[PDB]
Each structure stands twice: as structure tokens, then as C-alpha cells.
Amino acid sequence: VEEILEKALELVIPDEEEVRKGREAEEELRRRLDELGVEYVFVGSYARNTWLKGSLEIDVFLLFPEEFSKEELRERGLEIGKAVLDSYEIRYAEHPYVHGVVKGVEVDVVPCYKLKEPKNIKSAVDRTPFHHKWLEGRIKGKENEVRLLKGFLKANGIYGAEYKVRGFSGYLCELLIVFYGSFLETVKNARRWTRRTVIDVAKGEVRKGEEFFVVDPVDEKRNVAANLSLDNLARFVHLCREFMEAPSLGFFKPKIEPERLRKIVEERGTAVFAVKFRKPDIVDDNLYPQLERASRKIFEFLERENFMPLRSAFKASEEFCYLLFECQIKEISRVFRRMGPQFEDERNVKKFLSRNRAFRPFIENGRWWAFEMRKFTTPEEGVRSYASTHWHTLGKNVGESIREYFEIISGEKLFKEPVTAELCEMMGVKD
RNA sequence: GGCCCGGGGCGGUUCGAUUCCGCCCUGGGCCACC
Ligand SMILES: Nc1ccn([C@@H]2O[C@H](COP(=O)(O)OP(=O)(O)OP(=O)(O)O)[C@@H](O)[C@H]2O)c(=O)n1
Ligand SMILES: [Mg+2]
Fold it and tell me: Can you tell me which residues bind ATP?
């Protein structure tokens, strides 16, 4: 360990050239903003020197009086953001902000209400400046520890808190370091975390609760780890146990033949198909929760129709989106048996038998049963039907897109699509 | 936009639904975009 972590610092700590570049960009931002005479404050990992090597992104916050309208914040904010960046892009889900570059560095110009007491927030990001003040004096000296933690989560796919990841936010990493004292202590204790572990940083306590909860020092009602999924919490805990057991530098390093994949699927004997549709032109933060719903809704449909679904997944390229499925049943019989009433109450038995049927119901164990016919005998046939009539329940945007067009890609043609990596992961193909 | 909790109308399926699949309207929270 001791040694491994030393080498690890070389992958997480920014070199003197990247730091300079960030400082050079910092000064430029101040000079441009001072010329406008705007009120701003630097926050985030850049401000606390906790940003991960190769992930430099400066956060500048524009402070506005709380009396201001949210519309005003949006208009003035974007006005200032655009006038201060070399080039910019504007694309958000709810809270507005401008993304750009200043002297080769990524920058986020974010508008927010300058308040006192983060109790009742007015804009989604009002806590941020307060997180900064709380951390400034506590994280000073332990920033390399935060970086190891970030580099660890990043190299293993659970670093972002955004929906595409559902992992650990940067701020959460910093609270953990403040709570445990170091990357190693965090990892040692995380091995004992549970799905009901509550970490109260301000109280310096860990208690049992109703769900994994990391209390914000700035607001006790805020769960800093709110969007961390159970499975990612589990992957982290399991990763911590492995790292302690066999301390490797590979834990900080970021981690196939389409013809091989065909052989594998052939050997598994499963039904592997995908629902393909055009990708809605919307933010990742809106797209993903929809693909998750769409993916889940179809998966549940496949389970109640007895196709015995194994797993589902999804891929979103720039063109299309794909919802992936694997089922144990490639084809089921046309008939099935519907349970009827007990022979005892004749009223319902009469109604049951009056039903026009093709085979005539029988008695088994004191109750009537009837052979009914399915409307589809293959997983693909059912999904084609489901997705055509229930598109409205597949997410607001993903559902409307599927309404205007979708297709079921199966067999040979499916391995030609940009989903091969996703399938391998989904099927547990190893090597 | 997604999730959670709660109201008020419906339709389909079923011998049988409040409870299965869905659809309108609506109240309150929460999360992602910093
Ligand atoms: N889900 C989020 C996202 C952001 N923030 C706040 O916004 C700040 C800036 O977050 P961001 O710029 O997204 O990342 P950093 O925290 O700066 O860390 P890094 O850029 O390395 O990801 C955080 O410090 C935190 O106070 C938060 O509380 N919760
Ligand atoms: Mg940043």
C-alpha cells in the first residue's frame, strides 16, 4: 500500500504545467470579470486545489441579490457568461449556466443567489458557495488524499454523481476525506458500510438509518450521496475490500471480436435483441433516467409474459439509442393455462365456462383451469407489440421517439451495431 | 425530465381488481444539470 499510494499520486496529482495553465486562466477570468464589475466567487475543486489530474474545470459563481427573479438570473447570467468566455456552449436541464474555455481551460460560469444561511435554497445551486467556506479551512493540507479517492472512483466508473454515472460527487469525496482523514482510512472503513449506513460529518458520527445517507454539514436535510445507486455503493465497498486484500496500482488505471461475441451468444442459447430508435436531442441528465425507465418497463413486460429475462442494458450513441435484452426463452408455446374459480361457487364457474374458448376447461385440485392462447410466441414479437402500444409509458422523450420510429435488431445484424461492448458487459464475458 | 408520497376521474384485461396493464387531472417533496 504505502508504496502503491506513492506511485498513485503520479496519476492523480496535476503537474506543474497544468497548474500554471489553470492559474493563467484563473487570472484571465478575474481580469475579464473585473472589467465588467461583476460580483463573483471561485468555488469547486479548482478553488480548493482538489481537482483530479486531467480534469481541470474552473467554477465561477455569479452572486445575485435574492430579490432577483429566476428569469433575471438566467438572462443576466448567460449574458455575463458569454461575454467572458473565448467560446461557449449553453446546454442545461434546469439551473442555467454557461460552459466555455478561457486560455485553453474548461470553465463553468454559474449564476446563483448570494444568501445567508443555506436553509431555504432559492436556486438549485445556492448551497455551493457555503460548501466552499465549510471546506476551505478543513481540507487544506489533505487535498492529495481527496485526489487519490477521486482517481480511484474515476478509474472504476463510479466517480460522477450525474445520472449517467450515479456515483460519488466530488464534494462527497471531500467530505469523506474530512471525516476519515485520508484515502486509506476511507477505504478501510468503507469495507464495513451497508445500504443503511448514515455518515454525519458535522457530528463526527456514523449511525444506522433507512438508507445510505451522508449528511451535508451545511444542511442536515441534504443527503450528499442522494443519487448514488445501491449497486454503485456495493461496487465501491467490494472494491475497497479487494484493494486492501491485494493493493495494486491497477486500481487507479482506467480499465473485442464481434465474431467471438456471436459464438458466446450461440453457446448461451439465449434470446438477445435490441430496441433501436433515434436519440432525442436532449441533455444527458434527462435522457438517461428515461432510458432506465424504458429499459425497466420492457424488462418487466418480458418477465410477466414468461420470457425469463436475464439482464437489460442500454447504449446511447450520438445518432441512436439502444435498449438491450437477453432472455432464456427464445420461443414459448401458443397455449398456456389460466387459473379459474374453485368448483364450489357455481356463479363464477358459470361465467368462467361461458367464455368462448378453443379447448374446453378442466378441473385440477378442486378448481377450474382453461387453456388460453397467447398473442405472441417470441420475446421480439411481444416487445414489438408492447413498444408500439405502450410507447407513452416509456419516458416523455424516449417514448415519443419510439412512437415515431423503432425497430427490433436481432441475430446477425445486431452485432454490427455500436452495442458490442455493452453486450459483453451485460453477459459477463470475461478476459 | 426522472424518482418518492398522496388525492380525483377513466379505459383495458379478468370468473373475480382498490389491489394486473395503462390513461387523463391534480397536491406535496426529492434528485441530476454547479
Ligand atoms: N451533485 C452535486 C454537484 C455539485 N455540487 C456542488 O457543486 C460544486 C462543484 O461541483 P462540480 O464542478 O460538478 O465538481 P467539483 O466538485 O468541482 O469536482 P470536480 O470538478 O473534480 O468533479 C461542488 O463542490 C458542490 O459544492 C453538489 O453539491 N452536488
Ligand atoms: Mg469543476
Answer: 45, 48, 131, 150, 159
Pocket of ligand 1 (CB under 6 A): A 44-45, 51-52, 55, 57, 59, 128, 131, 161, 169-171
Q: For residue A181, which phi and psi values (nearest 5 degrees)?
A: 100, -25
Same domain? A325 vs A410: yes
Strands, DSSP E only, in A249-288? 271-278
Experimental structure resolution, Å: 2.6
Domain of residue A318, CATH code: 3.30.70.590
- Strand order in A105-113's β-sheet? A40-43, A57-64, A105-113, A98-102, A87-89
**Among A255, A270, A301, where does a domain finish?**
A255
Q: Report the run of H or E that residue A28 belongs to, with start and end.
A: helix A16-36
**Residue (of A53, A241, A6) closest to A147 by Cα position:** A53
Number of Cβ atoms within 10 Å of the Cβ of A154:
22
Cα dihedral A70, A71, A74, A77 sign: negative
Q: How was this structure determined?
A: X-ray
Tell me the Ramachandran region of residue A167: left when phi exceeds 0, alpha when psi lies from -120 to 50, beta otherwise.
beta
From CA A202, how far away is CA A174, in angstroms rounded?
Answer: 13
Question: How remote is the C-alpha of A43 from its chain's centroid?
Answer: 24
Domains of chain A: total? 4
Q: Which ligand is nearest to the CA of A146?
A: 1
Cα separation values, A393 from A276, A367, A399, A404, Å: 17, 36, 7, 14
CATH code, domain with A75 = 3.30.460.10
Could you tell which of A171, A201, A221 is best to mutate to test the pocket of ligand 1, judged by most ligand atoms within 8 Å of the CB? Answer: A171
**Claim to verify: residue A243 and residue A267 sit in the same structural domain:** no
| In a shared domain, residues A85 and A29 | yes
Q: Which residues pair with A113 in a beta bridge?
A: A64
The C-alpha atoms of residue A55 and residue A89 are separated, in whole angstroms, by: 18
Residue after which a domain boundary falls, among A213, A238, A255: A255
- Shared domain for A22 and A2, answered yes or no, is no
- From CA A249, how far away is CA A243, in angstroms rounded? 9
